[PDB]
Write a protein that binds this ligand. Sequence first.
Ligand SMILES: [Cl-]
Ligand SMILES: [Rb+]
Length: 129
Amino acid sequence: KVFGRCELAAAMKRHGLDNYRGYSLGNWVCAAKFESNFNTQATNRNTDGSTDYGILQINSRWWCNDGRTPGSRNLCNIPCSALLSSDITASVNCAKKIVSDGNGMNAWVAWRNRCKGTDVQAWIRGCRL
Ligand SMILES: [Cl-]
Ligand SMILES: [Rb+]
């Protein structure tokens, strides 16, 4: 599923991400935009052999199981394929664990590099939330 901007913001809010660990909704929308372009089916292989999955590009070394990643811990206890669903619950549940791991949203390098410190509220501007 390719979400619309406000559509995703509403779905993230509906799943308790707005202000989760102090990160406003715009932060999450901005991270999704640059990680996946709002496409739940996005997958990207890393140099280390792990793969990133879904709207927030969750990795298969630490977080989900894809059966082909050496040293996988599967800390979200899910198959990585669950992170590609049109329903974002699994991605949101796991992102909550990731953002709680100690480094906040810096866990998403694209968030650090493209969203952190910017006017992230613009990502939810206009939306009926
Ligand atoms: Cl933080
Ligand atoms: Rb596990």
